[PDB]
Structures are given as C-alpha cells and as structure tokens.
Design a protein around this ligand. Sequence first.
Ligand code: MG
Ligand code: MG
Ligand code: MG
Ligand code: MG
Ligand code: MG
Ligand code: MG
Ligand code: MG
Ligand code: MG
Ligand code: MG
Ligand code: MG
Ligand code: MG
Ligand code: MG
Ligand code: MG
Ligand code: MG
Ligand code: MG
Ligand code: MG
Ligand code: MG
Ligand code: MG
Ligand code: MG
Ligand code: MG
Ligand code: MG
Ligand code: MG
Ligand code: MG
Ligand code: MG
Ligand code: MG
Lengths: 51, 148, 193, 99
Amino acid sequence: WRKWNVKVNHNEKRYATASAIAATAVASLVLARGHRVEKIPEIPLVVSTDL
Amino acid sequence: PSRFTKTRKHRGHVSAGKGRIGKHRKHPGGRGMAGGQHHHRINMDKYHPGYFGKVGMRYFHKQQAHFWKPVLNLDKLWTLIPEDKRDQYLKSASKETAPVIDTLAAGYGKILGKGRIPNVPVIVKARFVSKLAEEKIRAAGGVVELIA
Amino acid sequence: AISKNLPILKNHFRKHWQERVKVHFDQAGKKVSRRNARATRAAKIAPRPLDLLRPVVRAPTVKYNRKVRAGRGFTLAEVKAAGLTAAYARTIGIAVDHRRQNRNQEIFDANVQRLKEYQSKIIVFPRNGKAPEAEQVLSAAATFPIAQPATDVEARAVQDNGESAFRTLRLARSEKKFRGIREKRAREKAEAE
Amino acid sequence: TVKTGIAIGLNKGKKVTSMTPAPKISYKKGAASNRTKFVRSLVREIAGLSPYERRLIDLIRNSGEKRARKVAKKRLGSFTRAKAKVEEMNNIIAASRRH
RNA sequence: UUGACCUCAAAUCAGGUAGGAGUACCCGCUGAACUUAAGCAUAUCAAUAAGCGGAGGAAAAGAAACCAACCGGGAUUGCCUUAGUAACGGCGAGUGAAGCGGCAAAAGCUCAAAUUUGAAAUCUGGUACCUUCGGUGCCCGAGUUGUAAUUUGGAGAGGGCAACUUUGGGGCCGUUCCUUGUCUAUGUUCCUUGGAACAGGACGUCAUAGAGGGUGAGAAUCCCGUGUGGCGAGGAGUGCGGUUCUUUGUAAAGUGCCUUCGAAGAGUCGAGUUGUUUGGGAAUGCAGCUCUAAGUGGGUGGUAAAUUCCAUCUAAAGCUAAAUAUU
RNA sequence: AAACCCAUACGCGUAAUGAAAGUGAACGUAGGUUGGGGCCUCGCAAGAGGUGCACAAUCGACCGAUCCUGAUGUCUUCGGA
RNA sequence: UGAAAGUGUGGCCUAUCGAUCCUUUAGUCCCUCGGAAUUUGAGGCUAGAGGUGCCAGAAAAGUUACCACAGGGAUAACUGGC
Ligand SMILES: [Mg+2]
Ligand SMILES: [Mg+2]
Ligand SMILES: [Mg+2]
Ligand SMILES: [Mg+2]
Ligand SMILES: [Mg+2]
Ligand SMILES: [Mg+2]
Ligand SMILES: [Mg+2]
Ligand SMILES: [Mg+2]
Ligand SMILES: [Mg+2]
Ligand SMILES: [Mg+2]
Ligand SMILES: [Mg+2]
Ligand SMILES: [Mg+2]
Ligand SMILES: [Mg+2]
Ligand SMILES: [Mg+2]
Ligand SMILES: [Mg+2]
Ligand SMILES: [Mg+2]
Ligand SMILES: [Mg+2]
Ligand SMILES: [Mg+2]
Ligand SMILES: [Mg+2]
Ligand SMILES: [Mg+2]
Ligand SMILES: [Mg+2]
Ligand SMILES: [Mg+2]
Ligand SMILES: [Mg+2]
Ligand SMILES: [Mg+2]
Ligand SMILES: [Mg+2]
C-alpha cells in the first residue's frame, strides 16, 4: 500500500504533450537528443500518407 | 523523496536532530489527545476554545437532504443564462419577452440579494427567496413566481 | 501529544487495520475482464442488446426530484396500456416492476410512449425458422436515452399581481405552525353550550 | 391530497395530474372471510375461554371495564389489544346472557 | 381362533448415506488480555486473536412486514460518495452507520392455507425386457392423519358470454468451449584477435519473426523458439447455424366483459424483566425467563405515553445466477 | 496494468449566522479620515498639486444571533414595518 | 437617602474561594421531539445552586525479611574531599 501511481492533472498532461510536440519542430532540440538530423533538409518532417 | 530528506543530512550526527538531553522517546506526553483537561490544557484553551462540553439539541436520524437549500445571490443570476442569449436579453430590456431562469434546474434552492442586477425584467422561478432579493427583482421590473 | 496550533484529527487506526487493506491493483485487469464478459454475453445473445429497456422515472428526496432518472421496471399498468403482457414483455427485453405504482400521468404516458417506440424499433424473430440476421446493437439505453422534460420556455411575459412571494412563504409557514391551535380553539368555541 | 405549488405549508409540492392506481390485493390481507369467521366462531365454542379471559369476565361484571383494561394491558402487552379484548369479552357477556 | 391396525424392536436383511483431511476466502458459536486513556474500574483494544462447529468454487444475502415523506423510489451484492457526518462516549480517550445520488451487474420466483370426489389421477422399491445418467409392463408397498394437477397476493379461483392467437422431442453436419499435436523465413561467406568467435571490420539476407533461451566470450540470420497463418486428434455441450424423422394435440397456455368469492404461516408478533451487543440515544438487534394477541388486522414511520389521522409494506414457511472475496 | 478519450454525479469552494425554528450581506462613485508604492501635471532641479492598488489604524454602513420599540393590517391572535 | 449638591452595583482598603459532565431551580412561556396534529413527558436557550481544600478540579487500604523489572550516584547506608 505504498503509493505507486501518481495523479497528474489532465491539463498539465496536455500542456506537456503540446510542449513536447512543439519541441519536435526545433532542430536545435532534436540534435541535442542525439537523433542525427544534420542532413535532414528541414523539420517538421512530413511524408505522404502512402506510408 | 528520500534523497531530499534531512535524514540523509543527519547521517554522521549522533542524535538525528532530536537532541542529546531530550532523547527522542516513544510517547512522552501521551497518545493522541491525552491531557486536554490536564497537562495539554493551555493548548486546548488557546487554540481550541469550545472543544470540551456539549451545547445544543440532538437530532436523531438527520438526513442531509431535508436541509438542501443552496443559495444563489442576485449578483450572478445571469450566469444561469448562456452567453449566447445574455446580450440579447440585456439589450432588449423588455417585457413580453422576458427571460425565465429556473434556478432549481441549475441546482439552487434559495435566492438572495447581494447586489445590483441591472434594470432588465427577469422571471425567476425559485423555491425560496429573500425579501431584498425579490424587492430588487421587481424593482428591475421582473417577478418571482414560486415553485416546488 | 497535543502540540502547536493544528486541527484536531480523527484518524481511526487504533485497530489492526494493516490486516485489512485492499489495494486495487486489479483495476485495469478487472476492467479487461468486464469487457471480455460483456463481449462473451453479447456473443451468447448475439442479436439481443445486452440490456433491458428500463423506464423513465422521477427521483425521490426533494433534493433530487428536479431530475428524472432510469428506473427498474415498467409498471404492469404501463405495459398493459402499451398493449402487451408482463410475461411476454420479460421475454422481449422489457423490465417489469410489480411493486411500483403509477400516480403521475406524465411519467405514465412518457413510459407508454417509450414502450411503443421500443415495439416499433425492435423486430422479433419467430420461434420457428429463418432468424433473419439483424445487426445487434449493444445498448437499448443509448437508443432510448432518458430525456429531461422541458417544463417551461425560454421567454415569457411578466405577470405581477402584488402578492410579494416572501409574505406568501411566510404565511404558509405561519398557518402550518398555528393550524392545530386554531382547530382546538374552534372546537372549544363550538362546544360552548 | 391536492398540492398547492410551493415548497412549504400543509400540502406543499408540485401539482401533477394524478392517476389513482388500482388497489393492491395485499392491502386486504387481514380482511375477514366467511370460511374464517365460521372456523373461529366454532373453535371458540369448543375450546372455551382461557383463565385470563375468565378473569376479565369477572372484572367486567364486578369491578367495571377500567380495571379490566388495566389487567388486560398487563396480561397482554398493549392498550389497544386490551381494548379489543375487553370489547370481545363484553360481546361474550351479552351472548352468554342470551344463551 | 384367525386376520388386521398402532407404537416399539431385531437382523453380517436389500440398497444407500455421515464421519476425516484441507480450511486463503465464506456461514456461525464462543471469547480474552497486552495496549490506549499519560494512573484506573466503564470505555478502548474488539463485537479482534486463540478455541469449537459447518460449506463451496465462491459462500452468504436476496425478490420488502424495505427506503421514504419526494412530482416519490422499488430484490440482493459490490465500488465512488454520503462521512470521520447524524449519533454513542468517566460527552474523556476514543468510537461511528444509514436513506438519497453516480456506477458495475442484473432475474426472477414457490409452498401452506381450496372437495379430484364421476373415480390417488401421485410416488419409492423388486422383477422381465429395452434404445439404460433412463423407459415400458407386472408385483408387493408408501399414502386419504393427504401423494399429483390447480393458485401464491404482482394476484387468483368458481360460474356465464364472446372470439382470436401460440406450441414438443429426437437424430446428423457445423459453429462455441476445453485439451492436445504438427507444419509454417533469412550467412554459419571473407580478414584480425583469441584456447573457443557468439568480439571487431567487410559484403549480404529475412523481418506481421531484432521476445527469450542455448551453443567453448555481446548471435535476429547455428539450434530451439518467436511472428503469421494452415492442417489435424480427442472430448464436454444444448449456447445457436443449418438439415432429417417424429406430430405432439379431440391436450396445454394467453387475452376481453359480467357476477359470486378471494382461504394468506402462533408459545409466534407484541409486551415486561435480565444479560449481551449496536452509532441506535426512555432501550438497534440477539438470547433467556414470565405474560401472550388480532383480522377493515399486524409491522414500520430513529423521544417514552393517550387520542385522532395519514403514508407504506404484508412477518412468524421457502428457492434463485452475475457483479463481490480469496496469504 | 501503459498511453489517449468521456457522460452523469460527487467532493471542496463561490454565504454566513443561530441550540434550533429559521433569517440571510450596497444610503453612499461598495463610504469617510489618516498614511501609503507606482502613475499623471507643473517645475532645469528642488519640490508643489491630482489620482491613490496592496497593506495598516480608525469611525461608520450591511447580514445573522441576543435585548428592546412594536405601523399599516387582522382567523383577535397572527403578522413584524 | 438627603433641603440639596451629591453618595450608594455589599462590608474603609489589602484575604475570606471553585471547570467539564450530571442533577436541580428560576426566566423566555420561547425552539425541537424530524409522516401530521392536541395534551403529558423529555430534550434545548439564558442566569444561579449541589464540588471537587492534591483548591486549572482521578472514584481508591496495607504488607513483602520470598520478591521482581526499568533506571538513578538527580538520592541515602563506607572511605575519601570541604
Ligand atoms: Mg529536529
Ligand atoms: Mg541519545
Ligand atoms: Mg522532549
Ligand atoms: Mg531532563
Ligand atoms: Mg493506561
Ligand atoms: Mg503510559
Ligand atoms: Mg498499569
Ligand atoms: Mg480464529
Ligand atoms: Mg448460495
Ligand atoms: Mg438463501
Ligand atoms: Mg467533507
Ligand atoms: Mg466498536
Ligand atoms: Mg437490558
Ligand atoms: Mg459475547
Ligand atoms: Mg438491549
Ligand atoms: Mg476603511
Ligand atoms: Mg448610580
Ligand atoms: Mg468597597
Ligand atoms: Mg458551582
Ligand atoms: Mg440540564
Ligand atoms: Mg492545582
Ligand atoms: Mg499489592
Ligand atoms: Mg524488599
Ligand atoms: Mg520491612
Ligand atoms: Mg551526587
């Protein structure tokens, strides 16, 4: 009966997810994770729905 | 969590912040509320005046639904109308088209007169009201029709 | 043990509570089990909607009487008026409650219309043959949602007659309070000679 | 039992047109029946009275119905039961005077 | 004298049944103290541990002698809440539910009390046969001190009128479930190190398979497997999906109107007292003793009593899955 | 057992006060006085004046309880301005 | 009370006394008994009394040389020290 799971407010969850999505369209932050996108022309990287 | 706790910092120090003379002991003043009329009396009188004794009249089998009477002050009283039609009704300050506000369906049992609705007519359906609230409503030009 | 300015706490842990602590780790798995059970039941009653038609009914307790609610069963008079018997209805997906009684014509006729809608919306396969495949849904409650009745309109004229509606409540309260005294006084008046 | 339309008073509540449902047969449960009257009347003949009923007959003849009701409230439990039993005993007295 | 009945017995009589183990969870009985109260006696610990009896895969409870006071709800269980609240309490320490509301899950019913009386229509057993979780025939027997049909209060029954509507059981092949088997890709190519390559580097392949394990060191591609689908086997089964044979049935069930009726549980309810218990407070339940009912009656309506009303149920008999618990 | 989505309720809060029955928060630019950061105006500046959130002190007003007073009126004992 | 001014809310001043809970009385004759009423009864509001002298207020007799435990040099029975 230790506390194992934590409540996080729904809107804080959504704030964080939106921030993490916005950080995807920043080549400075993607390189800083070590993702090897130096030769990638530009991000957000969008490909066709044929995939 | 455990690493931001002063227990980690007391490591090396003998008493763990509890003293050498006082010697953290099990329950030196008692368990719980022991001593309220005794050695904890000053605290119970300084910070809990009224703790000891019984005052009034008992109620056997009290149901907290006979006493359900949530109060709405006049100052709001248009929050019960949606934003879509509120401006309409406020600029068309007219009888023959006055808005109806069932406060019970919104979840209120009594209307009170805290302050200053505008001079627009309004029909207010309420189980209970106050003297001043109804005075202000019919001075604005409305009417309180009671319901159950 | 009593100390600096803090609220008096009533924490009821002076019994052997650690022997009785249920931690609901089973929340997710038990949800999975409920979903699997609903699926199995639906497959077993593969055309049927997994829930009986329940009536619309008015809640007790003046706190809650402003709200209408789903009830248990359709009040034998209601189904008789709907034009079918209780035994047949129970085999057709209609909950019947023999112990509730109709005192309100609005609720009565609303539930009767509910039953007529259900009878028009269902198809009942014969006991003999075909079984004409019919695309079950899983809820009769979603197909017949409980709607709150519209008691009034959104705008009306102002009809003020000068009764003040606070003195009204006041006088109702006062006559309730002093009813018996006045009846006793009238009795003592009538028994004068 | 008609309501007024307001939230306090004698007949407080909302006005709704009523229906008067059919009478439940489980409201006439203690209702007497001819078979049952016959059976009980017959059994009272052959079984007769009990000691405390005999005592009630005597107290009603001599000391009146008030002490009879007191004694019957003690021997039985309740005042209303005592009243009913004393009335039964008065009927018995009249019938035995006729017989 | 003979033959019955009643009650009681004996049989290594014919057939069966109980015991003990386990006991996490479940139904009960019994029942502490340490401890807390800064002492201690009520209290608390706790209606707990220990002790005893008794079950199943769940048990129990359960179709209201309920909750309510509402425009009323409507078996039981469980969760969220109500609520650390109403209330109990050397009113101290402490204890402490319930109605409503939201949800999971949902399912309803059956006996007694009625003359079959123009037909004990009912049933165990034995025995012959058969298609054997049983059936048919025959024969003793049980049983009228009441076995079947009929009805269970939501109703319902006996007559009278009037028309309509609906039905049972076997086989076969599938599907559902259980268990199990089997088949279903791609490198062991080159160099270095090393005892060993599963390491490093080069070139490649498969991928709905780069989960995991093994193999002389970190292996998707060496092996088992994994993933995706396929092909079988054996059962249980009435859940349904089709096909086939029997026609159940001059039977049963349902519905409308009139009329006469409408049986409804007793050493129980209830009361007094004692003890225990409960939040239950002039007495919540339980038990013991004493007293002991009624039938337009009785219970309940959380302040004892009398009077007048109202509301709501229908006890003293009974069965029932699911949601729930599980060291 | 994650992550994502959601209805209706429920909890706290938006109203207190009285044992309770119960009543229930604007005389006023939501008050006045004193002081108050910051802003504005004049001033080269010094400073003067205006406005003055928060906060503090104080006098008032409003709601409830208590103690009074007790109008129009009336089931003549209710009502309570 | 005094002509009056004025004095007087116990004793010329400094001491002469007492919570909760319970009971009881007085007052308002007011509130509640929660399905609705009447009358009893009971419970509530406000002010006192019944008392705790260990006097901020447990309900309380001894012994142990048969003794026990936690401790104390905060504290005795030796030396020593002043
Ligand atoms: Mg410290
Ligand atoms: Mg230490
Ligand atoms: Mg200390
Ligand atoms: Mg010390
Ligand atoms: Mg102690
Ligand atoms: Mg101690
Ligand atoms: Mg002790
Ligand atoms: Mg045990
Ligand atoms: Mg069971
Ligand atoms: Mg049972
Ligand atoms: Mg709370
Ligand atoms: Mg307890
Ligand atoms: Mg007792
Ligand atoms: Mg016991
Ligand atoms: Mg008792
Ligand atoms: Mg001010
Ligand atoms: Mg004076
Ligand atoms: Mg003096
Ligand atoms: Mg005193
Ligand atoms: Mg008192
Ligand atoms: Mg002292
Ligand atoms: Mg001793
Ligand atoms: Mg000694
Ligand atoms: Mg001695
Ligand atoms: Mg010393």
